[PDB]
Amino acid sequence: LADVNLVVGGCTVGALALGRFVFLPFHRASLAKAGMPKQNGMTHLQAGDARAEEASFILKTNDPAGFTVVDVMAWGALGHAAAFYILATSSLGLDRNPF
Amino acid sequence: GIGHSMREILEAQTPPSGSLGAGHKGLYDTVNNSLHFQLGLALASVGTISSLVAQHMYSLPPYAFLAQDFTTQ
Amino acid sequence: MKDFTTYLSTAPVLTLLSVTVVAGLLIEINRFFPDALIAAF
Amino acid sequence: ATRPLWQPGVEAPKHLDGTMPGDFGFDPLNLGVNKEALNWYRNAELQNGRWAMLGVAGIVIPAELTRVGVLNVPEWAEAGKVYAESENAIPFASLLMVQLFLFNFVEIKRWEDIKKPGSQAEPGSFLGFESGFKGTGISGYPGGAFNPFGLGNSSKEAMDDLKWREIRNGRLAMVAFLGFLSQHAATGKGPLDNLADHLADPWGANFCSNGVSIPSALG
Amino acid sequence: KAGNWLPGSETPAYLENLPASYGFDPLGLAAEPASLARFRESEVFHGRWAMLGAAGVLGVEVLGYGNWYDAPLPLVQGGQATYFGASVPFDLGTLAAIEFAAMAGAESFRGAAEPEKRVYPGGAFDPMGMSKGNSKELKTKEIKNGRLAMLACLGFAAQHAATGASPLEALASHLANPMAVNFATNGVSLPL
Amino acid sequence: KAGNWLPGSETPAYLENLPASYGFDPLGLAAEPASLARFRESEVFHGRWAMLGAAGVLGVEVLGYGNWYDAPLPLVQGGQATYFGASVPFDLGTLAAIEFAAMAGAESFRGAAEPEKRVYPGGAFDPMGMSKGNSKELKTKEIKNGRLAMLACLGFAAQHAATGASPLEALASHLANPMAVNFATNGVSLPL
Amino acid sequence: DVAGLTPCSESKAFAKRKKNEVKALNKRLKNYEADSAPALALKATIARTEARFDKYAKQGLLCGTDGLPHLIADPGLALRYGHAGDVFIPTIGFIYFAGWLGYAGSKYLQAVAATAKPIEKEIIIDVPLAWKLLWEGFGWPLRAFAEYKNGSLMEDDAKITVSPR
Numbered sequence: 006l007a008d009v010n011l012v013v014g015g016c017t018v019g020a021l022a023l024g025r026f027v028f029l030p031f032h033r034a035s036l037a038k039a040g041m042p043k044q045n046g047m048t049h050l051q052a053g054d055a056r057a058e059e060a061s062f063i064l065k066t067n068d069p070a071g072f073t074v075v076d077v078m079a080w081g082a083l084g085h086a087a088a089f090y091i092l093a094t095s096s097l098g099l100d101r102n103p104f
Numbered sequence: 105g106i107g108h109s110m111r112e113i114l115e116a117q118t119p120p121s122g123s124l125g126a127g128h129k130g131l132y133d134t135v136n137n138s139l140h141f142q143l144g145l146a147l148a149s150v151g152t153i154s155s156l157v158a159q160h161m162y163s164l165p166p167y168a169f170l171a172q173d174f175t176t177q
Numbered sequence: 178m179k180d181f182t183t184y185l186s187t188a189p190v191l192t193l194l195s196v197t198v199v200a201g202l203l204i205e206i207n208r209f210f211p212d213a214l215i216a217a218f
Numbered sequence: 219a220t221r222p223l224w225q226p227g228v229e230a231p232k233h234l235d236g237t238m239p240g241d242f243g244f245d246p247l248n249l250g251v252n253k254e255a256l257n258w259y260r261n262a263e264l265q266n267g268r269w270a271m272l273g274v275a276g277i278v279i280p281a282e283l284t285r286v287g288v289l290n291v292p293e294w295a296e297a298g299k300v301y302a303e304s305e306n307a308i309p310f311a312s313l314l315m316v317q318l319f320l321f322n323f324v325e326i327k328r329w330e331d332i333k334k335p336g337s338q339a340e341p342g343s344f345l346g347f348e349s350g351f352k353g354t355g356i357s358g359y360p361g362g363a364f365n366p367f368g369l370g371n372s373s374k375e376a377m378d379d380l381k382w383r384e385i386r387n388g389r390l391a392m393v394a395f396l397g398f399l400s401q402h403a404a405t406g407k408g409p410l411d412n413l414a415d416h417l418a419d420p421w422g423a424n425f426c427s428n429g430v431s432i433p434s435a436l437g
Numbered sequence: 438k439a440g441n442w443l444p445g446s447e448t449p450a451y452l453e454n455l456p457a458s459y460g461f462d463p464l465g466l467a468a469e470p471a472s473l474a475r476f477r478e479s480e481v482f483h484g485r486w487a488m489l490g491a492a493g494v495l496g497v498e499v500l501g502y503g504n505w506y507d508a509p510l511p512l513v514q515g516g517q518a519t520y521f522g523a524s525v526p527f528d529l530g531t532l533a534a535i536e537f538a539a540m541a542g543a544e545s546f547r548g549a550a551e552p553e554k555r556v557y558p559g560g561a562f563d564p565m566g567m568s569k570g571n572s573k574e575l576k577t578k579e580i581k582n583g584r585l586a587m588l589a590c591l592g593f594a595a596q597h598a599a600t601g602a603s604p605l606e607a608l609a610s611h612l613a614n615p616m617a618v619n620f621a622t623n624g625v626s627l628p629l
Numbered sequence: 630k631a632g633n634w635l636p637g638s639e640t641p642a643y644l645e646n647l648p649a650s651y652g653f654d655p656l657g658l659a660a661e662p663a664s665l666a667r668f669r670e671s672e673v674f675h676g677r678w679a680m681l682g683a684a685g686v687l688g689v690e691v692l693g694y695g696n697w698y699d700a701p702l703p704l705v706q707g708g709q710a711t712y713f714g715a716s717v718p719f720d721l722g723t724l725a726a727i728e729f730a731a732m733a734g735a736e737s738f739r740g741a742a743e744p745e746k747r748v749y750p751g752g753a754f755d756p757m758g759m760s761k762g763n764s765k766e767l768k769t770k771e772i773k774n775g776r777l778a779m780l781a782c783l784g785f786a787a788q789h790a791a792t793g794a795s796p797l798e799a800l801a802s803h804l805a806n807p808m809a810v811n812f813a814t815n816g817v818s819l820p821l
Numbered sequence: 822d823v824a825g826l827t828p829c830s831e832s833k834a835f836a837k838r839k840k841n842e843v844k845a846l847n848k849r850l851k852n853y854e855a856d857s858a859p860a861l862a863l864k865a866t867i868a869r870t871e872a873r874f875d876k877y878a879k880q881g882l883l884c885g886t887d888g889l890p891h892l893i894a895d896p897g898l899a900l901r902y903g904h905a906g907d908v909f910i911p912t913i914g915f916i917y918f919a920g921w922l923g924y925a926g927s928k929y930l931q932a933v934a935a936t937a938k939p940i941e942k943e944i945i946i947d948v949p950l951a952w953k954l955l956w957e958g959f960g961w962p963l964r965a966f967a968e969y970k971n972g973s974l975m976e977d978d979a980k981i982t983v984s985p986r
């Protein structure tokens with residue numbers, strides 16, 4: 006029924022646009038309020054966990070709004086999940102209405 | 105750079121009016137530092153799941169010709 | 178007489194008399210109103 | 219203090235003394251030891267007595283008139299069912315809900331009056347009618363709108379006497395209504411019918427021969 | 438304060454200077470100042486949303502286009518929605534997507550401002566300039582109208598879930614016989 | 630005062646200078662000045678509305694155009710409301726909405742004025758300008774006529790609810806047999 | 822019918838059970854005289870059994886597939902189908918009597934706790950005081966509610982001893 010290309014592309018573009026222009030302020034505020042995980046009062050890296058060091062390929066990006074590549078993958082994942090949910094629900098031809 | 109911090113979530117689960125007191129402040133360290141706390145939580149969950157498994161395998165047999173085997177059930 | 182009444186007021190004597198009175202009352206209730214399964218009023 | 223008591227020779231409890239109307243020192247269960255509880259029970263007694271007086275009047279007067287011949291009304295236990303089978307009879311559930319809705323407002327207002335007598339007299343509460351909602355200082359005796367004829371307002375002793383008459387009549391009507399309930403349940407007849415049947419043969423027609431008060435199992 | 442919700446009672450001190458306040462808080466939910474501020478903002482927002490919903494529910498039926506309960510049925514059974522008679526060329530998926538995006542942007546803009554701007558932003562939402570003149574009375578009017586609309590919306594939902602009619606039909610049926618057509622007569626509200 | 634209600638009673642002092650005052654207040658509803666002012670305005674308004682209603686009830690009947698009880702009857706069970714022997718093209722919904730809007734505006738403008746202007750507003754409301762020149766006697770006549778009209782309206786309602794006939798028929802029936810046709814004969818007013 | 826239950830009046834198993842019990846009693850009775858003591862005792866037992874079965878069927882009790890009476894323990898369900906006397910009314914009756922005894926004991930303990938020697942009053946009960954308090958315990962619901970609304974029915978947590986955590 007629904008075009009996989011059009012639905013997937015539209016959902017991914019919409020999710021990226023929402024996460025880059027709409028949900029970016031709240032996301033940044035929540036990230037600043039939460040911060041990195043801490044154990045006994047200090048971050049995992051400070052306690053001695055070398056593998057807990059934040060990756061450098063996300064510390065700073067050329068994007069003016071700070072929209073990192075990980076942000077792209079997260080929002081794209083949400084967009085694909087919604088797109089495939091729509092496609093799968095539209096593929097079924099049964100009556101799920103409680104009426 | 106993305107995800108949740110369990111410490112902040114626990115420190116934020118403090119209902120106003122002080123009905124629960126300080127709430128869950130310091131619980132993250134109480135669970136992470138103590139191995140017995142984690143073992144107790146894991147044992148409670150595992151025991152409950154074992155009971156759930158026992159209650160679901162007889163009412164909803166998942167293996168073929170299992171309901172006919174009265175001894176095995 | 179005062180000492181006798183005081184002895185009759187002790188915990189064991191009073192307990193046995195109270196249990197006997199309650200048991201007797203229940204026995205007579207069941208004797209005159211037997212097989213009372215529900216409270217039919 | 220030295221007023222008549224319920225049981226001559228027995229001293230009245232200290233929590234009762236002799237100021238409330240109908241104070242006969244009767245409290246063998248010591249239910250009114252607490253002042254707040256005693257006040258609530260006093261208000262409850264007044265309400266129960268007044269409602270019982272109204273009900274007993276509405277049950278005896280129509281029955282007495284019906285016995286004579288003028289004004290034919292059914293027996294009180296069947297009055298509710300008689301109206302139910304009427305043509306334009308209002309549904310029982312709807313009627314009960316409407317009565318409860320109106321009583322909710324009036325009873326809640328009286329409840330606030332019990333907690334604080336001058337509560338309903340708060341300026342601006344109503345459309346100028348709150349001025350007449352100030353009590354007389356004692357919950358359960360609200361002048362103003364009520365008591366339009368001003369009976370007992372001549373002096374404080376005159377009001378006290380009327381209060382005693384009211385409490386005695388209320389208690390008598392309460393006991394009378396309980397008797398009506400028991401009599402109809404034991405004997406499917408009206409109060410006047412029971413009274414007439416008893417006078418015909420008091421030794422052979424009473425509660426000892428109705429077959430309900432005295433269980434048949436014992437005999 | 439202007440009001441008391443209970444003439445013979447004492448009201449909380451934190452609900453004295455608030456507009457459209459009657460001291461109603463028997464459960465003491467707004468005891469905390471932060472919770473009180475959040476409740477005030479949420480109450481105004483709920484009142485506005487309920488006012489719009491009540492106006493729409495009554496308008497769709499008064500104008501003769503159907504009831505609020507049957508409005509989304511033609512769109513879920515396998516057709517197109519209707520607005521004033523015209524056929525809208527949108528389905529459930531597209532409608533949900535557009536509404537989600539628009540509401541997300543609008544609410545994100547509203548929720549990212551100052552606490553007072555999140556409830557009373559007269560910079561551009563007051564073109565008529567009615568706030569610059571006795572704003573407390575107007576605020577009281579808005580809150581009371583919103584409260585009435587909230588009660589009306591809950592009434593619409595409960596009445597339909599109990600009898601299955603519609604607001605206008607329910608009102609007409611009740612007016613036909615108030616003594617025998619009300620909540621006490623249906624076999625749902627009263628367990629008889 | 631000019632009157633005493635109860636020849637030998639002691640009338641209240643707050644009702645000594647008011648027009649058409651007979652000292653009638655056994656329940657003491659006007660003890661407070663605010664309540665007295667509100668009740669005075671309400672009494673004058675009620676008298677005016679009752680005079681208008683009684684005049685209309687008598688006019689529609691003496692003119693052979695119908696009774697007051699059956700006036701809204703043709704609107705129900707179909708439609709069409711007659712006026713002066715003509716026909717008005719309006720239904721119950723439109724009539725109710727028009728009356729509600731007009732009355733709401735008029736009363737809102739009247740109730741928002743000063744306390745004195747809410748009951749005695751001269752100027753534009755007195756085209757003939759006869760208010761000036763001792764208005765106490767005129768006010769007394771107005772209040773008394775209003776009280777009489779109020780009693781007349783209550784009489785119309787009670788008489789129709791008891792006997793079942795309209796004012797003129799009831800008057801003619803009583804005049805025909807003043808001894809056996811009154812409130813005592815009907816089995817409603819006097820039971821025993 | 823509430824939960825697939827058939828009234829004992831129309832229950833075939835109930836009637837069969839009554840018939841079998843009476844049959845066994847008559848079989849035992851056949852081995853005696855007509856006016857002897859065992860015969861009279863057996864006849865009395867038969868009469869009691871018949872009366873019990875008739876009363877159970879007349880009271881409106883519900884019987885299951887096994888033919889035995891079943892009780893409905895649920896307000897509303899028992900109130901609308903006429904089974905309030907199964908658990909509801911007995912619950913009220915118990916609660917009342919239990920509260921009566923508990924309140925009488927509480928009042929006696931609190932009254933003797935003010936005496937100079939309360940332990941002796943506990944082992945050697947004061948019969949007149951106990952009798953008076955037992956009589957006063959009949960108004961236990963009113964007294965308990967009044968004490969609760971008064972705040973005297975409870976002890977402050979800061980005045981009760983507690984373990985050192």
Ligand SMILES: CC1=C[C@H](O)CC(C)(C)[C@H]1/C=C/C(C)=C/C=C/C(C)=C/C=C/C=C(C)/C=C/C=C(C)/C=C/C1=C(C)C[C@H](O)CC1(C)C
Nearest residue numbers: 245246247248249266269270273276294297392393395396
């Ligand atoms: C004091 C004391 C103290 C100590 O310490 C202890 C003791 C001893 C406990 C005590 C005592 C107590 C008592 C006695 C009580 C009682 C009460 C009552 C009886 C009430 C009633 C009460 C009663 C009441 C209200 C009633 C009311 C009634 C009514 C309304 C009626 C109604 C009606 C009518 C009209 C008619 C119709 O057709 C029917 C009807 C519907 C039916």
Ligand SMILES: CC1=C[C@H](O)CC(C)(C)[C@H]1/C=C/C(C)=C/C=C/C(C)=C/C=C/C=C(C)/C=C/C=C(C)/C=C/C1=C(C)C[C@H](O)CC1(C)C
Nearest residue numbers: 488491492562563564565566582585586589592604607608
């Ligand atoms: C902002 C601004 C600013 C600028 O500057 C200016 C301006 C423009 C003015 C503005 C705007 C405004 C607005 C928008 C407004 C709106 C409002 C509304 C809508 C309301 C409603 C509101 C609404 C409401 C209240 C509603 C209500 C309702 C109701 C009661 C209902 C009732 C009912 C019911 C229940 C049921 C039944 O069966 C029926 C009925 C009977 C029907």
Ligand SMILES: CC1=C[C@H](O)CC(C)(C)[C@H]1/C=C/C(C)=C/C=C/C(C)=C/C=C/C=C(C)/C=C/C=C(C)/C=C/C1=C(C)C[C@H](O)CC1(C)C
Nearest residue numbers: 654655656657678679682685686696697700779780782783
């Ligand atoms: C003063 C005092 C004081 C002391 O202390 C106490 C006491 C005793 C309480 C007192 C007294 C009181 C009283 C007497 C009251 C009464 C009132 C009234 C009657 C009103 C009416 C009032 C009345 C009124 C408004 C009326 C109105 C009327 C009207 C509108 C009519 C209309 C109409 C018309 C035209 C015609 C058409 O077709 C129909 C209709 C539509 C129907």
Ligand SMILES: CC1=C(/C=C/C(C)=C/C=C/C(C)=C/C=C/C=C(C)/C=C/C=C(C)/C=C/C2=C(C)CCCC2(C)C)C(C)(C)CCC1
Nearest residue numbers: 017018021077078079080081082083084085086087089090
């Ligand atoms: C740089 C630049 C830019 C931008 C660009 C872009 C926008 C790109 C992109 C891209 C993209 C577009 C991305 C996205 C992503 C992500 C993704 C794509 C993912 C995913 C996936 C998933 C996670 C899935 C899953 C699943 C599966 C596997 C199966 C089924 C189920 C589900 C769905 C769950 C601009 C021009 C503005 C500016 C300048 C330059």
Ligand SMILES: CC(=O)/C=C/C=C(C)/C=C/[C@H]1[C@H](C)CCCC1(C)C
Nearest residue numbers: 345733736737738739740741742747
């Ligand atoms: C039925 C309904 O929903 C509201 C009715 C409101 C009224 C009558 C308010 C009236 C006035 C009063 C007494 C105070 C000031 C404003 C008014 C109009 C003069």
